[PDB]
Design a binder for this molecule. Structure first.
Ligand code: RAP
Length: 119
């Protein structure tokens, strides 16, 4: 189980009342960055689609739909919370990384994650 192979720093507090449980479906805005500061992915729209059509990432939590660091971190977050996650390679894409997805081998990944809603 532990200790966790990720760290969480809370950037914006959530409601501190509604926490996702394993099997809940969550919705999030995220930005993913490498240790060098390069943004590798984001689902946050720059403009004119900021609200018009953009859809947040949707997944069922705690069941291995996402990398381990996200799955465990989400369980610690409350609705509306914005957090910075630093995730070791072992709880991300492993030692090999995911080159076809732009993730280099053996690199920590930094995500800013906002938990919008829980179903
Ligand atoms: C264009 O953007 C991509 C997301 C990209 C992919 C490449 C990575 C770098 C990245 O840039 O995201 C990224 O930033 C990243 O690493 N992410 C994304 C955000 C959550 C954390 C992490 C992740 O785990 O991605 C995930 C990672 C890449 C793959 C998983 C890693 C954990 C492993 O255990 C899983 O095995 C199952 C596979 C991708 C996802 O977040 C999507 C949502 C989830 C899946 C594809 C799987 O759960 C899949 O098979 C179960 C499903 O059940 C889904 C719902 C089926 C439906 C049809 C697919 C929808 C696909 C949406 C794809 C999206 C939005």
């Amino acid at each position: 189980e532990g200790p966790p192979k990720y760290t969480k720093s809370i950037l914006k507090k959530g409601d501190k009342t509604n926490f996702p449980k394993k099997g809940d479906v969550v919705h999030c805005w995220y930005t993913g960055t490498l240790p060098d500061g390069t943004v590798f992915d984001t689902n946050i729209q720059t403009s004119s689609k900021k609200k018009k059509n953009a859809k947040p990432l949707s997944f069922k939590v705690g069941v291995g739909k996402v990398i381990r660091g996200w799955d465990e971190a989400l369980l610690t977050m409350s609705k509306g919370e914005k957090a910075r996650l630093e995730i070791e390679p072992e709880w991300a894409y492993g030692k090999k990384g995911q080159p076809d997805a732009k993730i280099p081998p053996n690199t920590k990944l930094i995500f800013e994650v906002e938990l919008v809603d829980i179903d």
